Amino acid sequence: CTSIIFSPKDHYFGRNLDLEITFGQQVVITPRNYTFKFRKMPSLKKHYAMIGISLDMDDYPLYFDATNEKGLGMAGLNYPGNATYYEEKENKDNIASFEFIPWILGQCSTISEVKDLLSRINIADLNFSEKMQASSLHWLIADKTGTSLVVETDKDGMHIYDNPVGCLTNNPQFPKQLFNLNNYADVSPKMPKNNFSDKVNMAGYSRGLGSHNLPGGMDSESRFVRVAFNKFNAPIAETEEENIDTYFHILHSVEQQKGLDEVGPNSFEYTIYSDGTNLDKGIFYYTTYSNKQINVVDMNKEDLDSSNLITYDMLDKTKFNHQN
Amino acid sequence: CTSIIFSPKDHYFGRNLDLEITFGQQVVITPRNYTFKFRKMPSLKKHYAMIGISLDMDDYPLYFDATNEKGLGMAGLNYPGNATYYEEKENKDNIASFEFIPWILGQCSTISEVKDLLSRINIADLNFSEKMQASSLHWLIADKTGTSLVVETDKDGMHIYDNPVGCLTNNPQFPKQLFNLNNYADVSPKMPKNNFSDKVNMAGYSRGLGSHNLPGGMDSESRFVRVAFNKFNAPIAETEEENIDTYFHILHSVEQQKGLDEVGPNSFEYTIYSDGTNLDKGIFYYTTYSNKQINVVDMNKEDLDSSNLITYDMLDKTKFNHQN
């Protein structure tokens, strides 16, 4: 998985979901008066409305990532082997990992409010069902000022980090992931100087040689570096159409192509989908692996005061434009 | 530029066109009875029909790449500084670089016929006009057996190479480009073995670590290695829709994103378009940088006995699908 906030003019937040199998995701809008039930907290009977990609299990939205009507966004990305969910604490809001996105996006409008709410939270070891055991996740949270932060629940407790580069992938823990970027200071959009020796003729035989050491791999660290390079060198435009086009080139640059990340016999982790929300306008965009026409769901064209889930199918089939 | 042949069941040939500035291009079917004129050879009054993308002129089809009705495909890719075109030779067929595709694709059906014609050819230093100086190219040729061939006109003469990997980018010369692949034997879709030492605990901390050393750069050798890894590990499917989807994932895996390959002040080489032809069926497909919905032009739906160029606009503007 890869998640970014991209702030050329308006602010766009979203992620690639990298898994080996698709099973029942939809675009889900949760309106303000849908009651969020919590295992160990009183229900949120009214809350901010939100939109994202989710499973719908027994009428409950298990969000992979979402954005609320105040321009606050949040995404849960795989964090295998690192994620720890804790015992219940008598002095904290005990919130399950699968309840984390509704808890936060339903109650908070800014990063500062997120931090305040997190000062009272305990991400607790609670499973949705015996069938659906909890996934191992860490979270990227960003708001429409362009500020972002990272939440990791490690063995020695929960850690919260300001995110100066506004990107997140998977393992390792954010301090190591962020520091690894320092090793790529010389990766450049421009041709290199001959620093090797002026007594040797270095021929600039290919445009693009500046990025010769850009990681191309499917792994977590390679995608973090690659998405950071793409994000901070992408062009800035004035229109919505241009900036969302650029946004999807950023995420598609770290797409996991089928066959390249093999996790088992004929089993391949790949980018199921790419989404992005205009945090300033509440507009949800997505592409899928097989359908890279941009699909648009406008949260503001729904009745956000209603009390039941609003669902749209993810258009995940190849759609061709036949010019005859 | 990157060009491949991809042979899952049917055979698909095409390329990314990477340039820092466009002047327009278009899809062009040249029918059988469009007379091909040649500066130094008699005209081909009748020939095979072909389809590809050319410059936005209707004087003459100046193809970037094309595929004829017999399943033979050919693409010219930037070869900066290496490409040498020769003085006219009395005992050869003197053919301009911009006449190469019509000359070959107009008369040849197989790689074997291509080689016979190439043995008597001389790629002459002729310009389409005094203003339109010939660009520096080398060529990938492939037919529907999956066999392919590289043509390079260097300063010491024309060299013709069998291509065992069916890929081509830009510099250097093909023996160096092909040999460089030997350095990436251990790049893997599966998790790496701990070869370092069984006394060191190596944590397989991220899926995709097998490809940690896959090159991600925008440069010529990086894209050659990366597209070969993508092509030979791409899944094999049974439907046309699935295999052409896969084909565009291979080409998009070596797309040059705007901003990442700087050739001058605010001037960036980027992937203008990606195209692919089903050599077996005569069906032409393309995406462009800003419109990655796949566009289809079926050559067999046209009057191939016509005498006039048949043209279609390249739809290069972002197409959104609004769902609510």
Next chain:
Amino acid sequence: CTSIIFSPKDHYFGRNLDLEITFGQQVVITPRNYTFKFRKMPSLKKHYAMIGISLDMDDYPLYFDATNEKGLGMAGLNYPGNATYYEEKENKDNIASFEFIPWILGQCSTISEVKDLLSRINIADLNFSEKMQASSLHWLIADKTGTSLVVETDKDGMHIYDNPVGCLTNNPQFPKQLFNLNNYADVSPKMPKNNFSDKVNMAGYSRGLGSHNLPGGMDSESRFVRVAFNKFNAPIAETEEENIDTYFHILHSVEQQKGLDEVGPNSFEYTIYSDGTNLDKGIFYYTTYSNKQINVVDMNKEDLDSSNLITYDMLDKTKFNHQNH
């Protein structure tokens, strides 16, 4: 800087010193009854003898690294910008960075005893003098069982790490440095399998292609990975001569060559020297940049009950052997 413990049979501990300027340093044995004086603690009037390379100033051994007579070793490696030394603390033993090696090596014989002393230490922001401001260092400590730990004094306090690979270089902090090794699991002494695709003919055109992605750089992470690869694939022998021979190949594999690491105009960081001590025997070995004949100083041939520093020159000029004479 690069420091290792190498444990083929006996145990060998030491380091490359990577700096841009030398002058002053000697092989220095501090005997049992040389009185170690401390700015904020009572003097150690008698203590374990030790041997190492030191800058002697005002009759005080400013050790770069040393090993004591009980087979405990300790080295201070550059930690630029990372090292933080603290205000004096009540309820702690306040010890200056330049007194750290005498404090530990004078009093401890084992890692377990080192850990006891560290639980009550505080590395204080104290300078040798106005002209000698304290260096930014972190420390590798190893004993003759082959166990080692790392001490790093960061902005948010002192951290002590068990060291499973027995190697240290410079920045970054040890958890990041140790975790970076995970990126090199596929580096191999053996020819690589063709994982790329069995549809592509990968020619095995050179021996050694298994190590094609081994880092060769002069930088701290590169050297950490390269020294670990060298150490864990080095052969093990049953002889002192062979095992110390191997030891210096490990250290020399990560030598910084003059001209390859420029830290300012006409100023280059390079490996001044490599040393190694046999912890089980008390034998100090070293080479220098211009003299890679192994020089030997046996601490046990000196009077370890004396009270004065005992010094030997670092033989740092090239000594050619004319076979033709």
Next chain:
Amino acid sequence: CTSIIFSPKDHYFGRNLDLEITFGQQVVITPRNYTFKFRKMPSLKKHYAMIGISLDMDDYPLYFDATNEKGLGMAGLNYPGNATYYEEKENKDNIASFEFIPWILGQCSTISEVKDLLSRINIADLNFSEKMQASSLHWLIADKTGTSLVVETDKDGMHIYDNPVGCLTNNPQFPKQLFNLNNYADVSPKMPKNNFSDKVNMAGYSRGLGSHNLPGGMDSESRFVRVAFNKFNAPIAETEEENIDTYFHILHSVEQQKGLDEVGPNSFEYTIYSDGTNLDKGIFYYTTYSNKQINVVDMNKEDLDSSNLITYDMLDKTKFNHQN
């Protein structure tokens, strides 16, 4: 194997010999009136004196590398699978690959003289003895002007190349080996500039980060790049002691450590010795894997008009200096 000419003031030519088995080589001075016998040419009864490392096979010097009294040096380096030796030719001096060094260094004093002799040569497929096949080699040749050239005998003929970097290792052919240097222009002794993006704070956390991408491997291409970086950034001094010290630091920077290049079960290729000769002065220097004190043999202190080989044992055992 790695071979260089290093030209700080005087000129130093030599090599690392990288093999898995030591045989029993020694330092051999061949005086002017030792008769060189050839299988298919008249004997060379008087010739230039030379010094180098040789096997000894009943009175015949089989040099790995040598340098003659006129300052011409030559080294045979493994070229596995690539070396082709030819059928005898009726119009050429047919010289065995193991006769090549005596043939050249016996009669030539300069690179230009070498090039004239090579115009009449045919490196023929002659083995030294029934159960000792010829080894597969290519050669680096250099003289006291600093100039060097490469001789490679490939399937399609002998190829001679001027060597602009004065370096050679093993496979592949020299054109590909040399061109690969272009991929390392940015490898630097100096700290890198932040070209990734100035919106990203890149910490220059370690001295030497400029060489972060210097290859460290044991393989042929890695050592070629690494010895070149070491050679052209090595300091230049006024005296012999200083320059020969620098010279061995260059060769030792590409030493293959035991255990790092496994060629078979419990069998490793390693640097058996490093040697260099002062071309201007005829002084021979060497280290061995286990003895890094520089050993010196002055060819000119011997009787160069003699008729018998003059042999010295290689001091290959560790010799310690006990200071107390």
